[PDB]
C-alpha cells in the first residue's frame, strides 16, 4: 500500500459525513508532498497528514493503523524516511485549529503505553481510548471523532 492509498482510505469517512470537501484527499496529498509529516517517536512511526485552506467544514480526526510499516518522508529532514504504523489524518478548518491538535498529538505520541495499545487494540477499543482522551482536553473536545474514523490498513 502507498501513502496515496492511506490518505484516500482515511479521508473516505470524513468525506461521507461532509466534514471535508469531496476532493479533500487531493489537497492532503499535495500538502504531504510539499511538507512531509513523518515522525519517529520511541520505536513507532507516526504520520500526521493534513491540509491548509478552506477544504474543511468541521474539525475532525481520522486514525489509521497499518499492519506493516509504509514509508513516509520525515517531518524533519534526514535520509532513510520514517517507517510509519499509525496515521493521524487531521481535518482542520484553519491553521490555528491544526496547531491545537498538534499540541495534543505530541503528548499522545510521547505517551509510550498509549501508542502501543493503538498497535494492538481493536478498532472499537481504539475509538473508546482516543475518544476518552479527547473528552479530557477542553481545547479540543468539540472535534469530530466517530467509530467510523478508525481503520486498520
Amino acid at each position: 500500500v502507498t501513502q496515496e492509498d492511506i490518505i484516500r482510505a482515511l479521508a473516505s469517512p470524513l468525506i461521507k459525513d461532509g466534514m471535508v470537501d469531496e476532493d479533500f484527499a487531493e489537497y492532503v496529498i499535495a500538502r504531504e508532498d510539499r511538507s512531509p509529516t513523518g515522525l519517529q517517536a520511541k520505536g513507532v512511526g507516526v504520520a500526521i497528514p493534513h491540509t491548509l485552506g478552506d477544504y474543511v467544514r468541521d474539525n475532525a480526526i481520522s486514525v489509521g493503523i497499518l499492519d506493516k510499516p509504509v514509508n513516509f518522508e520525515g517531518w524533519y529532514q534526514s535520509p532513510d524516511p520514517v517507517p510509519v504504523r499509525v496515521v493521524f489524518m487531521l481535518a482542520g478548518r484553519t491553521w490555528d485549529d491544526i496547531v491545537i491538535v498538534l499540541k495534543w498529538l505530541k503528548d499522545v505520541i510521547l505517551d509510550e503505553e498509549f501508542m502501543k495499545r493503538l498497535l494492538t487494540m481493536s478498532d472499537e477499543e481504539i475509538y473508546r481510548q482516543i475518544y476518552t482522551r479527547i473528552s479530557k482536553a477542553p481545547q479540543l473536545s468539540g472535534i469530530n471523532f466517530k467509530r467510523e474514523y478508525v481503520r486498520h490498513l
Partner: antibody
Amino acid sequence: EVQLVESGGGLVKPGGSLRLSCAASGFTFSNAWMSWVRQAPGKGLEWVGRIKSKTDGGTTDCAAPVKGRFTISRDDSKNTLYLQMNSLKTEDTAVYYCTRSAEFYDFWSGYYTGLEYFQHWGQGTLVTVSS
Amino acid sequence: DIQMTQSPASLSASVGETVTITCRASGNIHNYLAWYQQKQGKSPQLLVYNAKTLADGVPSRFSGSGSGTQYSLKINSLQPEDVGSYYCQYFWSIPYTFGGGTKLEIKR
C-alpha cells in the same frame, strides 16, 4: 431567465487596482457557487477563482498566478459577485467572465456542492492593463 | 496540478466529416472532464460534462468519450457553422485546468 451581467472592466495602469462586478438574476444567488474565468486576447480559457455560498463557508480559492493579488467576494443582498484586482500587470489583460458552477447533491453527507463546469456564462468584460 | 494537453491545436476539415479532438490528462481524472465550444465574439457554451453526458440543447452529433487520462470529443457530420474553438476542462479540483484549445477550420 438566468442572466449574468458583468461590468467594471476598462483601462487601468500597471500596478493599479480595479474591481469587477457580476449582477446575477433568474436563480437563487445565495445558494450558488460562483467563479471567474479569463481569456487573454487570442488565447485560451483560464480559471481564475471560486467563491462558495454562505452555508458552505463563503470562502474563496484562486489560481496560483493571481493568489495574493486578487480577491473574490459576494454580496447576496445585491446578488452580485466581485473580483478585486490589485497590483495589476500587463499579463492580466483579458476578457473576464463570471460563471455559475453546477450543483451536485451529496447523498451521504446531505450537503449540496459545486462542480466547476459552467453552463451559464456572463457576457464578459475586458480589462486592459496599459500605460 | 493536473495538466491538460489538447490536440490538435488547429484542425481543418471538410463538411460532413467526423472530427475528433483529444485531451490527455497528466493524471487519472476519472471522467471529471467538460467540453466547451466558443464562437467568435461569444462566450463559451458547455457541450459535454462527465466526459460523456451531452448538455441541454446540444445537437446529438456531438459526443464525448474516454476514461483514465485519455478523452475525445467527436463531431459527426461537420457543418459550416461548427467553425470556432473547442476546449476541454478538468473540473474535479484546483486549478480546474482548461486545455489549450482547438481551432476548427472548414475546408471548402
